[PDB]
């Protein structure tokens, strides 16, 4: 979470940082797989077929 | 100019973007933010309607409504992720009710 805070250039950890931290880890995602974090959002992900030409 | 026999041939010389661009840019805009997407007051009135059919004369804490909205939107965003995967699997790009029904069928939600 502190690493995500440094990446977002913010001093205080917000729930976005916790969401990014947990889901970028392969094992923390499986631990909290049935858990939704408030004000967390989702990871930026666009499918390949959906991209323009 | 005095060429009378076999003359010299040479020596003469609103804006509207394409469909799909704003959509992808809107996708990027909402994937970066985490603000709630369904408005608070219509959602709060809808939940009050649903609760009246379960027990009469009920009061809700404002935090209870916000928690209901958080879990509802997260469920719907995750469902549309599975729905989009189903539509792409069918060699399509457009989501359809058959995609949501297929997603909820695989989840076991009957």
Curated annotation (Swiss-Prot), chain A:
State the Gene Ontology BP annotations: heterochromatin formation
Q: Which GO terms describe its cellular component?
A: nucleosome; nucleus
In this UniProt entry, the residues modified to N6-succinyllysine are 30
Q: Which family does it belong to?
A: Belongs to the histone H2A family.
Q: Would you say which domain of life the source belongs to?
A: Eukaryota
| Purpose of the protein | Core component of nucleosome. Nucleosomes wrap and compact DNA into chromatin, limiting DNA accessibility to the cellular machineries which require DNA as a template. Histones thereby play a central role in transcription regulation, DNA repair, DNA replication and chromosomal stability. DNA accessibility is regulated via a complex set of post-translational modifications of histones, also called histone code, and nucleosome remodeling.
Q: How does it assemble?
A: The nucleosome is a histone octamer containing two molecules each of H2A, H2B, H3 and H4 assembled in one H3-H4 heterotetramer and two H2A-H2B heterodimers. The octamer wraps approximately 147 bp of DNA.
Output the lineage of the source organism: Eukaryota, Metazoa, Chordata, Craniata, Vertebrata
Q: Which residues carry this modification: N6-(2-hydroxyisobutyryl)lysine?
A: 9-10, 30, 53
The UniProt record lists the keyword Ribosomal protein? no
* PTM notes: Following DNA double-strand breaks (DSBs), it is ubiquitinated through 'Lys-63' linkage of ubiquitin moieties, leading to the recruitment of repair proteins to sites of DNA damage. H2AK119Ub and ionizing radiation-induced 'Lys-63'-linked ubiquitination are distinct events.
- The principal localisation class reads nucleus
**Ubl conjugation as UniProt keyword:** yes
Q: What is this protein called?
A: Histone H2A type 1
List every position bearing N6-glutaryllysine. 30, 53
List the range of the whole protein covered here: 67 to 119 of 130
Q: Where in the cell is it found?
A: Nucleus; Chromosome
Tell me the residues on which N5-methylglutamine occurs.
39
Keywords (alphabetical) are: Acetylation, Chromosome, DNA-binding, Hydroxylation, Isopeptide bond, Methylation, Nucleosome core, Nucleus, Phosphoprotein, Ubl conjugation
């Amino acid at each position: 979470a502190g690493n995500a805070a440094r990446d977002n250039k913010k001093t205080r950890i917000i729930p976005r940082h916790l969401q990014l931290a947990v889901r970028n880890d392969e094992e923390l995602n499986k631990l909290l797989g049935r858990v939704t974090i408030a004000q967390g959002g989702v990871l930026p992900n666009i499918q390949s077929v959906l991209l323009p030409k | 100019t005095m060429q009378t026999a076999r003359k010299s041939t040479g020596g003469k010389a609103p804006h509207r973007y394409r469909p799909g661009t704003v959509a992808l840019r809107e996708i990027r805009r909402y994937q970066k933010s985490t603000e709630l997407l369904i408005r608070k007051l219509p959602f709060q009135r809808l939940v009050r309607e649903i609760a009246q059919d379960f027990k009469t004369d009920l009061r809700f804490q404002s935090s209870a409504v916000m928690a209901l909205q958080e879990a509802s939107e997260a469920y719907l965003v995750a469902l549309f992720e599975d729905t989009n995967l189903c539509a792409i699997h069918a060699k399509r790009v457009t989501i359809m009710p058959k995609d949501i029904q297929l997603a909820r069928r695989i989840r076991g939600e009957r």
